[PDB]
Amino acid sequence: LAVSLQEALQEGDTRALREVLEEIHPQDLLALWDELKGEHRYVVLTLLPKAKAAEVLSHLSPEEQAEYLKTLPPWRLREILEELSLDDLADALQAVRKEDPAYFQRLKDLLDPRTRAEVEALARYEEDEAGGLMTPEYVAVREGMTVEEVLRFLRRAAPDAETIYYIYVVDEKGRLKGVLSLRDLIVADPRTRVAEIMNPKVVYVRTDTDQEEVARLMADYDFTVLPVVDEEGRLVGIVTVDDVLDVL
Amino acid sequence: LAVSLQEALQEGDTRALREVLEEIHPQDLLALWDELKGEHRYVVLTLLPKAKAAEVLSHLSPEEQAEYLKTLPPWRLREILEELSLDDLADALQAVRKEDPAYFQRLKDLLDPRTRAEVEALARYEEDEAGGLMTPEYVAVREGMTVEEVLRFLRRAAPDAETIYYIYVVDEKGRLKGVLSLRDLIVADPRTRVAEIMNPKVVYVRTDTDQEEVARLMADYDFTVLPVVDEEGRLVGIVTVDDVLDVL
Amino acid sequence: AVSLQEALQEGDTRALREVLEEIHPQDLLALWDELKGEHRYVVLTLLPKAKAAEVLSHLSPEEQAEYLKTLPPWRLREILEELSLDDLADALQAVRKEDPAYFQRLKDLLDPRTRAEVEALARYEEDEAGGLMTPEYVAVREGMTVEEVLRFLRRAAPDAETIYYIYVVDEKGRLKGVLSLRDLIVADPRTRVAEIMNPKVVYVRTDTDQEEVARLMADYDFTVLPVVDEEGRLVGIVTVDDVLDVL
Amino acid sequence: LAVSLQEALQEGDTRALREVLEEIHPQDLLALWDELKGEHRYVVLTLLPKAKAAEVLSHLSPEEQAEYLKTLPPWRLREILEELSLDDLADALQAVRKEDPAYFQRLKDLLDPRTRAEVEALARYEEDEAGGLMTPEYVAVREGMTVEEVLRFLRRAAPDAETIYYIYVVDEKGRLKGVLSLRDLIVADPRTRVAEIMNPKVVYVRTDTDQEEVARLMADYDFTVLPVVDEEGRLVGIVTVDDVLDVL
């Protein structure tokens, strides 16, 4: 299959190339990523579907992340940057700023105003603490909602959430008050209020919490996702376990 | 023509395309503007000579104005920003802050100090009043100047003036005192003083004045340009009829 | 002229420094592009800062920008701090036309007040009064007596653009009268300014066109002209040398 | 030796000088600092390796700090600002703000967002209290970690830590609960938990504590570092004695 794109690569006509790419897996593209030359990398990135383009970008080394964000054509930029999970977006920009603070500024200029807001908050954190690892794309609900309401909410919180298997519950002020699983929603009666299904003794993590402490906590409680809070006890993000394996 | 453009786009060769853009009229490009795909618009705006690029921009909707002031490359920005007439520059910046005040701020930073000085003044007026429509790029002279001197002045005022067919006359304090046309000047004797050709009975409009009042007034007296004064009677700008036709 | 080149052959600081300290800026200005990067670099290396600045104020905007990029940064703040504010603005503008990043850097090098001062001037049209004026004039109050004004002028002199014309403002700084150095000298040392000053002052607005400044300058046969803002406050003076230079 | 430096300045030739700068100690450079003229200091700062360049800046008077942050070329600025310890960077930026608030602002723009985040936090505290002296670059751990885990932890905490000879202990909420020394970790069993080596009897100082008290307290208990907490008991920084010796 590596030759299969190169077959399509050499073919010069995109149409053959576009049908392989739409079924190539990111990781299988990631593996063969560095036997590819500038013109190749350029064209595959010219119209690799934006979800996949973004996905590959996230798994490259910071050096190559920066290189690729100076490679792709600018009409493609806002797409890819807007497709990135915010955690991955921050990492990408930090990678960029390390070599080119000017371009870092340029990139952020491209963002939708809310997205820039979001990333700018995340970027303020130490890359190797919870904040530097978290993403704000989680599902939060309040105590009074019933299970039915929570499900209807999750099915449109779904397009953009990092994960929906864990639903966090905060109050009026947005401070953490409980945690609930998708599995829990399912076993329970649709009009059960969340307040008796939620677990009130939530294990949480601070934005300055060291990543290996996050890793230990994750291995101890055997959770794949962990909530992150600010000084006021407010849920500000979640750290997913995949992003913790990557610190090894 | 239309085919002349699309051919050049697909060929990828900037030869055919710079050849098309340097002779295409902005309005013919504006007409086909939303038969264009993201990469196309980028490329036309990357290589359309700056005066036309600015021309198109002024005729896009505020929404696309904001968007394309974000797609274009930064070296192109300061050009387009400096190439806009000050009324249109103000409009464009307003369109941007409506969506993205962060980027609104970064843009103004790109402006030269005179332009930021100038634009910030206009930005202070209500967009549907005389100030929201005026430009400071008008030509003013004193009553004592001779037709010969006024004419020599026009030839170095022209590059930047909105219009030079009407010449406005102010005093020591710069408050409005008279008006004369380029035609009155040509009909007149080269050593004739302005104070004797000018019309002292000038119809003016205040920054306060609602845009439709600018329209009724423009239509009655059949002027294509109308002067704006402040509360102390000082000329601060002129409103031309084209910007008033565009109020529909 | 070769007297320069002999100093070149010397390779010597002193041999070159001795001619540079007695060369007139205009005589340096004439042969300036009989000089190569190597020459201009070294002449600028230790040419006395006042003169260095003087030459700079008189180069074409393209070469000014170049000149501000050749000299070593320890010399930059010197030369920049020596420029009259009118000339400093013009120099930075020249730079920004080609390189806005460097324009930003230069301004970073300024003393905070000089930056403030230049930044005000930079907002004006290069060909209107504000673009031509310099804020380095002498202002006094109406109640001062002649001796007091002279005292001021003797320490106002080092930095003032000119001291031959003294302008009179009030508590809030609106123009009140104009006075000459000559008037001060013919006059009695305890005479108050308010009886010697001329109250009907001819002024120019910051948006006033430069050729109107030239006419006014030629009509009233003045060499310096005061510039005011919209509130009637003296904000600068335009000297006639800078108006001849528009021709 | 010391005189060998002036040789290289006079050499005009860079290589002779880079050899000197590469082995001169900051203090030996600081000693001779104002027998130097502008052209020299510039060149010494043009070519002095960034840790040393930052070291010298840090021991200069606030006035020369402010000055030399203006003489150095901007490509060096971002280096030196990022190379400073956070306590010193906060001190240096204040030195600049006292003379030139405009430039004070531009510098902060050069800062990386986490660095700006951190420094802005330190800037809020009074220069003559614990906050004005502390640095957040300390190492904190949990009670449950073993001696083994911490020792592994310190080997990736050290590069940025002010000091690692004292390791501090906080809880779920990050409030101070205990202290232990690096020697305590080394003597102890690799499987021993921190909660059993740590001294729960911690001597602390709040952010508003006057410097003289930090000195009084440091001299009594014969400590070289002292922890700082907020009003809710959360560890926010450490004060080292070298910054207390330099209060004279």
Ligand SMILES: Nc1ncnc2c1ncn2[C@@H]1O[C@H](COP(=O)(O)OP(=O)(O)OP(=O)(O)O)[C@@H](O)[C@H]1O
């Ligand atoms: N951050 C958290 N803090 C506290 N409890 C949590 C947190 N995240 C999830 N939980 C709890 O963990 C459980 C979710 O586990 P899941 O439903 O995946 O089943 P599991 O891993 O097989 O274990 P079990 O079936 O025993 O719950 C729920 O009880 C949920 O309340």
Ligand SMILES: Nc1ncnc2c1ncn2[C@@H]1O[C@H](COP(=O)(O)OP(=O)(O)OP(=O)(O)O)[C@@H](O)[C@H]1O
């Ligand atoms: N805003 C204004 N207020 C008052 N008077 C004006 C204004 N604008 C123009 N005028 C006067 O009206 C006249 C219109 O002159 P213009 O150059 O438009 O000639 P025209 O319309 O081609 O010929 P005509 O005016 O004789 O029909 C000008 O000479 C000017 O003096």
Ligand SMILES: Nc1ncnc2c1ncn2[C@@H]1O[C@H](COP(=O)(O)OP(=O)(O)OP(=O)(O)O)[C@@H](O)[C@H]1O
């Ligand atoms: N900008 C100005 N506006 C109005 N009056 C001025 C201005 N500048 C100078 N004057 C006045 O005009 C006169 C010029 O005197 P100056 O020092 O030029 O000697 P002069 O050329 O012989 O003039 P005079 O013959 O009038 O004395 C002085 O009285 C001065 O106060």
Ligand SMILES: Nc1ncnc2c1ncn2[C@@H]1O[C@H](COP(=O)(O)OP(=O)(O)OP(=O)(O)O)[C@@H](O)[C@H]1O
């Ligand atoms: N800030 C502090 N507050 C309270 N206790 C502290 C603090 N810092 C250190 N300690 C305790 O004081 C002890 C002294 O530290 P350290 O081991 O460096 O001492 P030492 O001089 O090497 O040997 P000794 O402790 O025998 O004098 C540490 O073991 C630690 O438990």
Ligand SMILES: [Mg+2]
């Ligand atoms: Mg990260």
Ligand SMILES: [Mg+2]
């Ligand atoms: Mg993730």
Ligand SMILES: [Mg+2]
């Ligand atoms: Mg408008």
Ligand SMILES: [Mg+2]
């Ligand atoms: Mg217009």
Ligand SMILES: [Mg+2]
């Ligand atoms: Mg000027």
Ligand SMILES: [Mg+2]
């Ligand atoms: Mg001058």
Ligand SMILES: [Mg+2]
């Ligand atoms: Mg401090």
Ligand SMILES: [Mg+2]
């Ligand atoms: Mg310290």
